[PDB]
Symmetry: D3
Subunit: 248 residues, 6 copies
């Protein structure tokens, strides 16, 4: 893949979105690829942390759109697959939010264990109501969990962003680096520099044991959300509203 | 009913408490009526949102109190009935908090999906400990969910209000309109004006699909809370403490 | 026990850590004793509230460390026993945080229903990753519940404190008394003075009824966390990492 | 109570229905009394087994029937109370079926851990459909559990007995003593004689440990059945059908 | 529909398979139609029982088989739809087994509340292993429930029939009419004649109340089985094994 | 291991107890070894069925018994380990019962998916009450599931065998080969001969898909039983009763 790279640095398996010119819009095969990198990280016994980093001004603008139009099966398969990979991952998922994330890629940011922001202009947008669709990527559970149920209805029902202030107010962001949006690259490096200091001394397998115990609180609910979100959407696709809306 | 009106405006089924002289105190039949308006809204295929609006300085002061005194069966039936109607409603419930809500009507404000406040003097009071009673209207689940479990014990155990600051700190309020308490009517209009702009463009059935998926996270827990709250209270009624306290 | 006292004052069963010289470090038998005081409080029909108070500058520095080294069975038995006593207690648990709590005693502070702080220097530290161990004392459930899941991963994975600001931001603390750390004794008295005013008027059995309904939301999850935390740790003990680390 | 006696013989707390002239029909206070004997047995640390024995040709013909007619609250309270006592009992419940059981007393026979029959004419009848009522005494769970779900619908829907053949076919009866119905007294003695031989040698607290682990499989489902059976019946009582039918 | 008729006789909504020449093989639209008859029966407030009757020597031989071959979506939609209709039906489902049932129609016989057999040659066959498929029509739950888990593995793993003896041994059949297979018509009439006698006297809404309480024991498990059976099969379809096998 | 062999024959991974002189009594390391053979079978993508075969007149007489006596930790570790391996195994487990099984090895026979008996003298004995112990090897769930809850209390409470008649009455045995106990070897061969015929034609991965869906009905309950059985036993070991009894 040309749009996504990865490397391993000690106990950190680093994944990087490197298509800043297209706002790291991602296609179905890019979400499959992302899911296969998480499988590589999950099987590497040296890796303890999987860091998701991007580039440019946006973290990701979400799904890139260009009865064979029954092409929506490959769209739903790709969503379920990469959502499932984020849900079951056993290594510590850390998102470096270098800017806004929209759609499915905003959903994956909400499934990460720890999130860091470049600055206070980041936001998460879930435009399901404007696309004639419903929750996806496990957001049925992840948004009420991490932002509270009333805030969640305000954002989702009226297609409004989860902004920085709301993020800080719910503790979704562990640390804001307060750095210019023109350099994601320095933000990417300074997070890894800070991660290298905080793991010194620690017994890393302990991080994995805690995560495993922590993930069991909601693992059923996340897995069921992945399934009922798909099921419930089929009828939106059969009606055809998403198909108009997905064109302007 | 003279104390409660309703009208439909496009996709908004609007319910309005219009007894500002008695602080919109409500009797058992007023809670039944409220429950029957939610059934009318829930069956109207044009309605997508049910807005609960009040009048005057208070949203509601709660239950209006004036072996035939086994009149507590009609009090518990009315609580279960209207709590159940709020729990199962499939349209987006939006509360316009024009002032304080106390008791059962404070419980229904906590069951709404979205809440807006007129100003920073609003509060929610659950005086169960001062009435020799226990949680009701599904507050066993709704308060820890939307305010956090420690805050919940502080308010409930010592009969203390959930004030505006606590509300904003937990994101219970989506927007404070910062308007004088002498005009609920202008606050009621400006919320509907803002709701008319935010639904433009959206696919409304999408709002319902998300809600249905969202409500399933806690539907069992809310339904069981409605039942065990009643069960567990019976013995408080059999002792007689509420009966003294319900008189001064 | 010389390090822990208790007394009863009306409806308040008061437990007090009185070993400020050793930062109220506690041994296995001190955690057993704590668990037996909660059984005495839980069976006293006059008691409605169990207040946990300490002394000096620290609330508690946690476990005091000085194939017979299979002495870890008595360490795991003591943790399960006192965690279980906090989990099932039916009286209102109120912690007077007079300073930092670390380890197992930080875990018990997170199981209390209501927490008050002496001042803004208090913190909670869970150094499991630095000891080659995993979550304990029901923290698998209590930390994500009361601080949110992302904040929880940041603190636990990197051995970082849950500080005052994070505490206030999640509403973990009901009231900060803003008093010097040199006098826990005046902080202990002023909390009890304020508790004596807030219970006046109330029907105390109502406090117990609400708690019982409130505790049922998570009782299964807390009991299972107590068990799987032990189970999952055994292999950390069998490896031997904790044994080195527990020495410097 | 004149209709019910009890005695203790080593580790056996023996309860005996001794009103053969009225077919051991039982009134509300007799079901309360039965429930209080199970509390005495449950608290006696010497008792390991609670044997329920009757007299005459019937084990029990069920409830004995002779807005004050809101006397149905004391009928529902008595059912919930004695059902709950059978559900939570921690000692081995053994029923000596000396003949047919009908109604609520047939429900309690289905909640016993072990059942012995005098002869092949015993039967269990649940006439809920002929009384304009619904399942009670936890039969919603106990009948499908111990007789299978299709057999259960055939018996309940059409008011038909669970006969001996059906009982043996599902293993509801551990042993048929094949003795005449004219002597329950010899059947009562020969069961106790056989119980005295089978406990010799055994570690009795082991019987209690197994039961505790065994009861946890369905304890939630039994407790919820006790509650939803009552809830769901209220509307049958409010209609009035049971009231006619309860008279001929 | 030419292959399926229905009529209403007092409280019995009678559905009849009338294509004995093709062994009542059913196509996708015939399963949809069956599902729509259950919706008509479920909404008719006069109906209390829905009787499923067939004709000829077989109850049904199952699915009738004659990238457009992505025709398997309409095959999976039809299975989920009619399985769901049987799962949620609120009226008493009674199957008149006039002979063998195979496949999806054998699955629907296992979802009926009560089953009657014409004679001892009836059998139920689930040939999933011989078709390169997996459980369907909720058989994941219904077979272990009504036949026991070991018997279930023997039949399913090796493509072997659930025969009459196994049926009687688990109480799946309420009554065998012992009548020749050459006249389903007289068997159909004699069941309805016997149903007309057994409902006399009873309070029919009581049948519905019991069913509602009874169905709640497993409703979650049946609904989840309907979903995970589909999900898990997709990959069998993507491999292509069913497609060969579905041809000979 | 000298007492246990294994071989692979097409899709059958065959495990064989070959110590007929000691009635295939098994030690802790033999249960570990059994657990490691199930891991080898579970990872072999060619294997679809794991057949457990024994030798001589007994299938197995159970645990072979010959503060270092804190040797009970290695006894509880071995039980949990091999129980867990049987619980999670994904290949079809088939037990060839060549005679009686007692203790932990009787527990593993109850965890097999399919059971065949040599003749009608086989039995399963769970002597927990005679050893001052409680249920183990997941029998808390497996016995009530496969034999019914009343039968289960009769056998367990009074230390009585689950005999052949009870086995056939609950369908625990798929087929009795009716062969002399002097030749387990011919019974072992004739089962494999019959297994080779029944798999011909079938799509074997289908067997695995069904099993996976089937095992999910009770997987939580089996895993929790494995844990709470151990937990609850510790106090029986701390008392010391098992230690006397384990000697005569």
């Amino acid at each position: 893949n040309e749009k996504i790279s990865y490397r391993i640095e000690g106990p950190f398996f680093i994944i990087h979105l490197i298509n800043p010119d297209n706002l790291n819009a991602l296609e179905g095969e890019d979400y499959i690829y992302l899911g296969e990198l998480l499988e590589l990280a999950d099987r590497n016994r040296d890796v303890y942390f999987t860091i998701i980093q991007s580039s440019g001004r946006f973290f990701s603008s979400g799904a890139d759109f260009k009865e064979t139009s029954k092409w929506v099966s490959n769209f739903v398969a790709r969503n379920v697959y990469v959502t499932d990979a984020f849900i079951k991952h056993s290594k510590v998922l850390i998102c470096c939010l270098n800017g806004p994330a929209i759609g499915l890629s905003a959903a994956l940011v909400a499934l990460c264990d720890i999130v860091y922001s470049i600055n206070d202009k980041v936001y998460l947008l879930y435009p399901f109501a404007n696309l004639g669709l419903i929750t996806e990527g496990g957001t049925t559970v992840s948004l009420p969990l991490k932002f509270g149920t009333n805030t969640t209805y305000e954002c989702l029902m009226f297609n409004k962003p989860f902004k920085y202030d709301i993020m800080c107010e719910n503790g979704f962001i562990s640390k804001n680096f307060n750095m210019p949006s023109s350099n994601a690259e320095a933000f990417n490096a300074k997070v890894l520099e800070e991660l290298r200091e905080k793991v010194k001394g620690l017994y890393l397998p302990s991080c994995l044991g805690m995560k495993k115990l922590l993930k069991s609180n909601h693992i059923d609910a996340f897995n069921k959300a992945n399934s009922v979100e798909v099921n419930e959407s089929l009828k939106y696709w059969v009606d055809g509203e998403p198909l108009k809306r997905f064109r302007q």
